[PDB]
Amino acid sequence: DDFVAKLQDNQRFRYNEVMQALNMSAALTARKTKEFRSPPQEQINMLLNFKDDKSECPCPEEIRDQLLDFHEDLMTHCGIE
């Protein structure tokens, strides 16, 4: 619940931030505005790729840290750790 609430808020913020640069950059509509045009499943697919260190995921550090902590807690509960 709260993870996707924060993720949706930040995605809306990023969208409304980039909309000012739409007139500034013509290629932007082909290079940067890809997540907003991407299929909804594949949007969260890159949004949840802050796993490992590939780090192409457009997710801020705090939102990444929330899920990183929750996943460690889940592994500890499952006994994997």
Add this chain to the structure above:
Amino acid sequence: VVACFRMAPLYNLPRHRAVNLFLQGYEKSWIETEEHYFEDKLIEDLAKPGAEPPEEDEGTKRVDPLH
């Protein structure tokens, strides 16, 4: 025009739909990819005669759990 190029985005999707999506994405991206190595220790524990000779059977060797 811009709306046509866009599809429905996540921030416009309802919370429960986005939650179901996130559950599936988390399952495929994080849970499945997570790997833990337990096979060798599990097989060793199963193969161990669990104090079977200390256990007084006075008979043929009892089969270990792996057996």
